Amino acid sequence: FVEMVDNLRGKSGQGYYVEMTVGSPPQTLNILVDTGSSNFAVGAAPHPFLHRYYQRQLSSTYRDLRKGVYVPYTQGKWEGELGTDLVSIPHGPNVTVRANIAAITESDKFFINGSNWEGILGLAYAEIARPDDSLEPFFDSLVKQTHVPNLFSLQLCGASVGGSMIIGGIDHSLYTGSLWYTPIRREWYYEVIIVRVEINGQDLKMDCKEYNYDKSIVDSGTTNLRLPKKVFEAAVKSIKAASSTEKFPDGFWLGEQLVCWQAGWNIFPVISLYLMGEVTNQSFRITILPQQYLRPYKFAISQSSTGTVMGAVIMEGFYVVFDRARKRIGFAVSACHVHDFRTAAVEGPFVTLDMEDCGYN
């Protein structure tokens, strides 16, 4: 898939985007790659902060759906007008698809002043698509209308950042070792189940339901490793305890402040998440380094009321395969992850009982 390798661009903290074309004749747009939502939504009006926007008046293949959608968030918000058009991905499958498009006509604190992307590619499932699950997400259209296989994979490599979105397959050069698969619990978000958490090898000994309360998702659209409050609580003290060589202000661990050192790692613990495996009572762990959770530094582990979010802190350490056809997600050590002595790891198999109990209901 040499043509799809390195098809992702971005800026640090502003997300990863892929180039797409929309309409006839094609209009090029940079589009955020977002495994955490399910709408294909593009700016369609001259917002001052956007480099370009979808102009429906220029497209011969645009079709109005005569329906509006309103989408609020934790901070941001957008509303738009639904329609359909021909969509392509220049550095992807040589293929063209009619997909739903939410033409964004108004927004607040959503788009990023400074970013080079003007749209969102929600790669998650219909169940959380807005207004409702009747609105066929892009990837479902891609699979129905073409012979592109029902999966994609992401390597996020991390001032410019880069990566690859292999659509319809797996490029074996982007990972070392073996891929280990965790089941997608339910097809809405990419929901997974964490069955054990170790800081530096030491179990936090929490009930495994807390790790996934109320959920645990894989989200390319999130920067941090976001954990539920109670888990995050226990995580920080363990990490703090493991890092007693030097001291830090309490507020910083809450992201309410930054920290900085001098040019020219070991005083920080590795972090392992055990995931439900493919077989009963078997699991595997993914391990990250401080080079993943200390972003150039800021502590890149936050607390959450929406559950565990495995954001770029996790994804930049691994090659992640979204095997939709087999309802599972594969993790492998990324060939582009930054390391020291130590190295990001994906290891198994392990025996873990009652893993299904770790899920929340």
Ligand SMILES: CN1C(=O)C[C@@](C)([C@@H]2C[C@H]2c2ccccc2)N=C1N
């Ligand atoms: C975490 N998340 C959101 O808050 C909503 C969206 C749709 C939004 C595109 C993500 C985003 C995060 C920060 C700034 C702008 C957009 N995607 C997400 N996965």
